[model samples]
Target chain A: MGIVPTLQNIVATVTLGCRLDLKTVALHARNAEYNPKRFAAVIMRIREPKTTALIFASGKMVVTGAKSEDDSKLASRKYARIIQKIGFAAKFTDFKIQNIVGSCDVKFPIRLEGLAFSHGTFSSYEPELFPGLIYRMVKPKIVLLIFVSGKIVLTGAKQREEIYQAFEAIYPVLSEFRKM
Target chain B: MGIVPTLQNIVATVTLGCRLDLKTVALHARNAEYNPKRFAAVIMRIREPKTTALIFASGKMVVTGAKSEDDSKLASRKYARIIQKIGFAAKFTDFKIQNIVGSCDVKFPIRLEGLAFSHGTFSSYEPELFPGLIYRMVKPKIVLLIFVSGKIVLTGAKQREEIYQAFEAIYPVLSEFRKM
Candidate 1:
């Protein structure tokens, strides 16, 4: 509720081939039987050039606009099924759908420049990457910057190989980043 | 969308509560008024403390089973009013009504051992504390262990304050710990 995050808050970007419906993506996540609490509520903002994404209430999963509509649908299905396989044991359709939205004709390139990266929730401020990866930022042409929490930011796309590389680079340093 | 995040993948716990019907929640969010994107979707979960919760998908919103049936209607009306204030223009009746069974006989004497604690969402997670405090996890007398991903694992209860101290101690350490 304080300092509501918006497209301006976007410090990372992920581009995909398919268009994404913010509501649908969020629905997929909310309907996930295994982790319903993860997608219970959502908040989103998408502007030209970059999208401001923030889910400030309690919920784990958050997805944003993609490059194409097909990609968005596929992304939803992909995530829905993945959640099901994650030990979800119920019908997916019966869950409550909170909200979804999509944006078309968004500015082509997402800007990661000037974005500040921090560690842990809203605090634990640190710009440096963890021990696993020494690199702070890598701008892959197509990527999705997903921040489920302070520690986990899932960047989809930008080549699976590259993602692993980017993650591997930081994993070592971040290995001990757990709160315990 | 491949590889759903595990307990190791997430770092915070956000609990949220919204009063509007699920459909209106989506519609208010999708209107081009807030952002250029006009798509919205939502998902819900039906849970039982006795077993794992079941997640379901619904494009509608219905918070039924209130102390009185009218309570449900009033809850939606109030929810609609709040949405309109936030730039969403819609009526409570406009949304799809998806009914999902919720908690029953929630028992709790949550002991925090005199710690000044805050109950609310951390970051990027939905805040499930509106209309009333959103229920995150329920641990009778024992401490319910919350994993990194916010998954609740009840270890059964014991002497009250011991569990209270456990939650109080861990509260400060959560990936997303903010006193609301």
Candidate 2:
């Protein structure tokens, strides 16, 4: 139970069901900024859930930086409400969690070579390209980035259960390769 | 100076200026075999360079298993000769080397993790996905696979110079992370 990986980030997408005016949204919303020259989206932030949202002119929105799905849903609503008060008919719909990232520390160094060798086709370690070994778990379809210092990053999980299951399944496998 | 990596395999392609008959070629040539139901190519082999050729009815051919480009070129001509003896007016045109794979040993155990870490952005290691760490060298665009046992596989070389330059460029870098 205590071995569960903690949520680090969550990303969810939503449709506002109406075309948006980027200029007006950015001008009226104090927490929003839009610079079409740089990127064609209105970036807004919320303090409660502490999320950053990218609002597109086509009424599409991508909310990120939430630690939980519950927070992510609420953050989407908060952004939608912020847009509503700005006089745009923005209705939240098609809410879907894009991805979730979770992380945990194994509290010890790991022999990555042995882990990669034993796992063979499940793990990929390109140390010169990146400092972490990416372990792809088949059951949950989540990618776990493992480091020598035992720090692990779990991503590609659209549901919280996936993250939990991935960490649960990988813990014992990782424990087997713990460096003495 | 003599520690050059040895070519393990070579792949090349050629075009015959005429259409082919798989059944006729397979029956006439002692080394050719064609099974249209299983695959659409006539697979022919040679003993000298120990190569395999896949001949399609469209007169397109792919030759593989040669140890060097010279052998690959000669093998293509040999296959053309084999086909010419069978009846088709075969001509070896547009011959090009597709890929070359070379391998070498670093002579001692090397710390793959350190090599990957020290060359971050140039190497990638995924332990669960593959056993070897892939080091992508930029100047020559050759990829080197470094294993924990110090054996290395170099591939994606269209020319011999790329392999020699990659091994030369990497030998010192690898020696820095040799496991004690």
Candidate 3:
């Protein structure tokens, strides 16, 4: 009842029932590209779903950046449809939401390291590696990555409720560590 | 925003009004057992909330394996109702949470030696003696038994919030001790 999160993106994974020839899909689908040697995946993007797809030699696939479950499921089906359109025995067998991502933009900047050093137990920041400070919530199993600019990305949950609970759990800590 | 620690199991103590006859309640209850020679208390269980109850002769009761506080209280009430139906004149009172326990399977192996080396101050790992390294968190006053199989068990929390805090405080350390 206090603070609610605005869900923006969802990622769903699917099994295509049969093996996929990565090279064939790369050539068959205009958006797909499989650098067989450089990368063992046929990565493609479709504007209709406004999402990206990752196809591998195995029957499994990943579709990301959809808004809701309906959109994510539809996009996954469309991804399998694209694979099937190319004459592969592709069928969407197992579809599951891998992760849901949402964020909050506090109207204030944060000294990321201040909180980082204070709660080092929950902090994971490496400036040389990642600009965002990683804070993993244990209860709801959600991850929050916050930038110094006050933009925080919350993820690592298949349920949007988890995203909200994760943020609400950290909101007090966020207020405790707020900067000018 | 929505990630929150789920209440897995809890142990509660129930105080009934006065000393009761275990034999009567044991006879009245369906899933109850009373071995006067071996165990003085009447032991019973209910699968709805999935809890086990121990009814002693002193009108004291112990309930375990509850999912939440309400469930624990409800379970205690259910036990009290059983005694009430048995003509014990049992009155339910003083329902208290004894211990809250939760388990997390991180799906990755954790290097016990690495984490124990860095934070041995409040951690214990006697491999031959016990399989897991028991970590005592200072702030939340909770204990965690982290094993090599990535199964972390947290217990000794009166409240679920304490469990959540203790795990969040230890999560990053677990991340650093990833065996892979």
Candidate 4:
């Protein structure tokens, strides 16, 4: 029951307020690449914040791979600054957090059979299709990827607090179905 | 904002309380097939209730493809009856509903850019990666797959009520971001 949820990834987006040239941005930016055949946007990354950004010609930016909310925001700003530095007249406007993913361990092996059976209504456990049990928690509205090894991943949370709350609420229920 | 959510698939499972000879059962049963090389279960289907059941060696059964809960349960019972008829002391010891998937239409085109940008915390729209915008709702704990063409898919619901509630709640917000 003494489980602590750790943030795994944070996704945020920002509008540069001006159209960006993918080729120019990729050429000017150090860690930027644009391959229209593979993707439609310029993929950019920053080492300090350890985040990647997808820069679109519509002036849209999607920042991902950050470990925390603050880091996500900081990374988004850095990407926008890079776009501006590349002469795009980029302005950080309409900044928003897209999704937050976190993970934690319950420390005790989970009785996936029993839990998936009893909570069948809210859980999907198909070992053949996927190794982990997918539990859709309705209260916090988080999708938990639960493994029999006691590791649980909480995804689709907008805020970090929701991830913590979801893990806190699920810890007891998972413990109740711990494997003997 | 008018949206009608309809159940598409219901997945349920049960234990027969006795071991099963999958190959023998498949040979005897008309609409059953067992190929352990591909899958470890006897994949059986019944046209009466229109469902498929995966019969495992350990006497466990997973029934899917049913459009309603009642149909899912009825189909499970039919599969169990088939197993019983094939000379097995199969008893439906534990029957549980695993997951309910549903879909609905919002009846109008949605501005994906506006919706994803403004509600970035809970919404993820990557048209290049995926056409649908993945909205993770917290209150009902439903993951919605929203398309620009107004089609919405609701998954991760144990009960149908959550699907309805989620769509009802999201209708207004989607309307607010409707394309002009």
lDDT of 1: 0.28
Candidate that would win on TM-score: 4
Candidate 2 lDDT over residue span B34-114, tens digit each = 765455778899888898788888998988788888999999998888888766789889998766668888788886754
* lDDT string, candidate 4, A1-180, tens digits: 236887776777788898877888889998888977645678778898888788888898988778887787788888888878778788889887768767777888888866875677777655543467767777777777788888877777878889989988888799888865
Compared with the true structure, what per-residue lDDT tens digits does model 3 show for residues B36-102? 6645678888887888787889987878777788888888898898888878788889987766666
Question: Where does candidate 4 chain B have its weakest 10-residue lDDT segment?
Answer: B124-133
lDDT ranking, high to low: 4, 2, 3, 1
In candidate 4, clashing pairs total: 5
- lDDT string for model 2 (A87-153, tens) is 9988989998876667778787898866754564455444543456656565775667788988876
Q: How far in Å is the alpha carbon of A5 misplaced in model 2?
A: 0.6
The candidate scoring highest on DockQ is 4
After TM-score superposition, the amount by which residue A166's alpha carbon in candidate 3 deviates from its true location, in angstroms, is 41
Better of 2 and 4 by DockQ: 4
Q: Kindly list the per-residue Cα lDDT of model 1 for residues A1-180, writing each as its tens digit.
A: 121111111112222223334444456554322222432233443333223233322223333343333343344444435434434432223121112211111112211211211222111111121111111232431111222132233222222344334444434434334232
When summed lDDT is taken over every stretch of 10 residues in candidate 4 chain A, the lowest stretch is A123-132
lDDT tens digits by residue: candidate 3, A22-108: 877788786566663354888878887798887767898877678788888888888888789888789888888766767777767
| Model 2 misplaced regions, further than 4 Å | A1-3, B1-180
Model 4 residue B109 CA deviation in Å: 30
RMSD of 1: 24.6
Q: lDDT score, residue B124, model 3?
A: 41
